[PDB]
Amino acid sequence: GHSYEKYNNWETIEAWTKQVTSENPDLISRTAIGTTFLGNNIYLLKVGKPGPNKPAIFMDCGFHAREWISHAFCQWFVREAVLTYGYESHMTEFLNKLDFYVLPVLNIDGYIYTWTKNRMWRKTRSTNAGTTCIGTDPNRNFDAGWCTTGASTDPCDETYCGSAAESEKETKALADFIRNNLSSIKAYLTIHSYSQMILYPYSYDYKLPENNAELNNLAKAAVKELATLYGTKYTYGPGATTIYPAAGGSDDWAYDQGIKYSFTFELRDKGRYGFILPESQIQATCEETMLAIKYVTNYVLGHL
Ligand SMILES: NCCCCC[C@@H](CS)C(=O)O
Numbered sequence: 001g002h003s004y005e006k007y008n009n010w011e012t013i014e015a016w017t018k019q020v021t022s023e024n025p026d027l028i029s030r031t032a033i034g035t036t037f038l039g040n041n042i043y044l045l046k047v048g049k050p051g052p053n054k055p056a057i058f059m060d061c062g063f064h065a066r067e068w069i070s071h072a073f074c075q076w077f078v079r080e081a082v083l084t085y086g087y088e089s090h091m092t093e094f095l096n097k098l099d100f101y102v103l104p105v106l107n108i109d110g111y112i113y114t115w116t117k118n119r120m121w122r123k124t125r126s127t128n129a130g131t132t133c134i135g136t137d138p139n140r141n142f143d144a145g146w147c148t149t150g151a152s153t154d155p156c157d158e159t160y161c162g163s164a165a166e167s168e169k170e171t172k173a174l175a176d177f178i179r180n181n182l183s184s185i186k187a188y189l190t191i192h193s194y195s196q197m198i199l200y201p202y203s204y205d206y207k208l209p210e211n212n213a214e215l216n217n218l219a220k221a222a223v224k225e226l227a228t229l230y231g232t233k234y235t236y237g238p239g240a241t242t243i244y245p246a247a248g249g250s251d252d253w254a255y256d257q258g259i260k261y262s263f264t265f266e267l268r269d270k271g272r273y274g275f276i277l278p279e280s281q282i283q284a285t286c287e288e289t290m291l292a293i294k295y296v297t298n299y300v301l302g303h304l
Pocket residue numbers: 064139192193194199203239243244246248249250251252264266
């Protein structure tokens with residue numbers, strides 16, 4: 001049984017993507033952008049009402065297996081969209097004018113592993129040459145200063161950059177989709193946990209983006225908006241100085257593709273439960289995050 005207020009295993013989320021798409025045909029369509037190392041279909045949900053030349057926002061969750069609240073948020077967003085469409089003026093205008101590509105779980109193999117063998121697994125589950133150690137850090141596997149800093153060359157490490165950029169089937173599929181739909185995608189949003197932060201390019205080097213002032217003010221207003229609900233405190237800024245250097249990020253690569261609005265979200269909390277955030281906090285976490293996400297969405301729509 002699927003529930004937005006609890007963590008659902010992969011068998012359930014997969015079924016959920018098919019059921020939610022069938023229950024909302026005028027608003028949701030589903031497709032597979034590729035398959036994982038273990039051959040699992042990487043599902044993508046296109047949320048929005050059909051229209052001509054609609055701009056789009058790309059959001060993905062579950063890059064890292066153990067960050068369960070991340071997976072739960074993507075589902076929650078879809079929940080909000082279909083529930084409030086028509087009653088809430090902002091969400092209705094968002095879905096009416098632009099499309100939302102929601103990728104529920106990128107690292108499916110890792111997610112499954114966290115449910116069956118190791119709750120704290122982070123990387124993918126592909127193999128590595130010359131060792132029995134498994135996995136690559138998908139957020140260190142993109143072509144952006146790839147493997148130069150804040151990422152390890154040791155395949156037995158949790159931030160292993162992989163054998164080459166896009167060496168992972170999952171990251172290659174994500175990069176390909178965005179590359180194929182670059183002219184329509186105006187914003188890239190990637191959901192993680194935790195440390196409560198809103199980061200923007202870059203993390204692979206200590207440098208700032210062309211529209212630094214704009215992203216900084218947007219991140220600042222988004223954080224302020226999130227705090228309005230429960231007073232949850234978030235920090236924000238360029239990845240390198242706000243959290244730490246970390247080359248190979250999808251947010252940086254996306255931005256370097258030309259997507260001016262690229263943000264990485266580190267959801268609740270600040271370490272009390274860490275990755276094992278209680279299911280009792282799912283509602284509050286997702287509801288406050290919706291405020292930040294919709295604030296960014298509104299800004300994007302208004303500055304096309
Ligand atoms: N593109 C890097 C953004 C800053 C780090 C995010 C963090 C999320 S867990 C990580 O993946 O280490």
